[PDB]
């Protein structure tokens, strides 16, 4: 009835904003979990970029790639929302810097370049996720078409549970070795776009790594995080939202509140 009470709370919250909220949370110290609509499908939006970064680091680890190799794209027509890659179009970027821009700034050019050259496209991204035991994740399209968030569309979706389980494996588990993992954790911690989402649901002095998504259609937006409370094992939180009408705007406050409720549920 802790879990029952939190379910009712998320249900009211999703009704209050005429939308749908999916949650999965884990306390890695007790093993307690909480889920609401945790097996239902929600658009990934840019949230997959967090996993794209992990896939890059795994290639470096397999010695298929060098973290400091220069990636040049001087002639490319860069995607909308390429703030970092545009700045370095002239000089190029290291792969590592390009991967962390994709994560930390949600950079679309970084994303597509990496998928084109190193990861084997949406199909390759999906393969990477299957390789770590994630059978829900699917990436079907490239940026920016993957953000359409059409009601009923299963392209470019996962479930709140699969996302949480995967971030657990990547950030805290053993897919990456201890050196490579440390880099990945530092990339998540440095994320710039999540101040009003999961980070807003915990104390400022806790350490948080996260990746957001904002589709910009159908009120669809999300966030996942690893949270290190002071003197406590880490928490994993995965929050996904959609809303009913195309023109609806996402709700950062709803995401933060759902995180608060999920965190209470496992405590
Ligand atoms: B994406 O899903 O992630 C992303 C975020 C985020 O992660 O929350 C912020 C800014 C851009 C992006 C890129 C990806 N999304 C898009 O390309 C569409 C997005 C949605 C509408 C816009 N909102 C900014 C002010 N309204 C920005 C583009």
Curated annotation (Swiss-Prot):
EC number, as in UniProt: 3.5.2.6
Does the keyword Protein transport belong to this entry? no
Indicate yes or no for the key word Hydrolase.
yes
Mention any Pfam family matching this sequence.
Answer: Beta-lactamase2
Query: What is the induction note for this entry?
Result: Up-regulated by the carbapenem, imipenem. Expression probably regulated by upstream promoter elements.
Which residues are the active-site ones? Answer: 46 (nucleophile), 145 (proton acceptor)
Q: GO MF terms on file? A: beta-lactamase activity
Tell me, what does this protein do in biology? Class A beta-lactamase which confers resistance to the beta-lactam antibiotics, including penicillins, some cephalosporins and carbapenems, to JM109 strain E.coli. Acts via hydrolysis of the beta-lactam ring. Has penicillin-, cephalosporin- and carbapenem-hydrolyzing activities.
Q: What is this protein called?
A: Beta-lactamase SME-1
Q: Which gene encodes it?
A: SME-1
